[PDB]
C-alpha cells in the first residue's frame, strides 16, 4: 500500500494542498459529479485558463468533465458548486449552427471547452479534492 500525504499518483494532480482528478470512466456529466463525491471533492469547475488547459492537455484520448451545469440549454451556465460561470470557455467565439442541446460543458483537446448536452461522448471523469495530507492538529497555532 502507498504511503499517505500523497493520493494523486498519475492522472490526479496535487498542488499547494489541493488535488485534481483526471481519471477515466463513466460517460455522463452527472456521473462525474457523483465520482467527485466518491473522492470527497467537487466537480472541477475550472476557473483558470491554465487549469482548463492543464486538464485539456492531460485529456488526449478523451475530453474531460467540469463543474458546469446549465439550467435548460442556452440559458445561464451555473457551476455544480452553485456558482455562476466567471470566465467560461465554450468555444472562443464560434456560436456554431448545430443546436440540439447543452445542459453541461465538456473540454476538448483543442485547448478549451465545448458547451453541449451532458450526454455527448466523453470518457474521462475529473473532480477536485484536497490532498490526503492532514495530521491531527493538537497544538493550537498562535497561542
Swiss-Prot record:
Disulfide pairings: 5-133, 8-19, 36-127, 104-118
Residues annotated as domain C-type lectin: 7-129
Binding site for Ca(2+): 94, 96, 114-115
Top-level lineage group: Eukaryota
Glycosylation sites: 141
Protein name as it appears in the record: Low affinity immunoglobulin epsilon Fc receptor soluble form
Gene name for this UniProt entry: FCER2
Complete-protein stretch covered: 156 to 298 of 321
Amino acid at each position: 500500500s502507498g504511503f499517505v500525504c500523497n493520493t494523486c499518483p498519475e492522472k490526479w494532480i496535487n498542488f499547494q494542498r489541493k488535488c485534481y482528478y483526471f481519471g477515466k470512466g463513466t460517460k455522463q456529466w452527472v456521473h462525474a459529479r457523483y465520482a467527485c463525491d466518491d473522492m470527497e471533492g467537487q466537480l472541477v469547475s475550472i476557473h483558470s485558463p491554465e487549469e482548463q488547459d492543464f486538464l485539456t492537455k492531460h485529456a488526449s484520448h478523451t475530453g474531460s468533465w467540469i463543474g458546469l451545469r446549465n439550467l435548460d440549454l442556452k440559458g445561464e451556465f451555473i457551476w455544480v458548486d452553485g456558482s455562476h460561470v466567471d470566465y467560461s470557455n465554450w468555444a472562443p467565439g464560434e456560436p456554431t449552427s448545430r443546436s440540439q442541446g447543452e445542459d453541461c460543458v465538456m473540454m476538448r483537446g483543442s485547448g478549451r471547452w465545448n458547451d453541449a448536452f451532458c450526454d455527448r461522448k466523453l470518457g474521462a471523469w475529473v473532480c477536485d479534492r484536497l490532498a490526503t495530507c492532514t495530521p491531527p492538529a493538537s497544538e493550537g497555532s498562535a497561542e
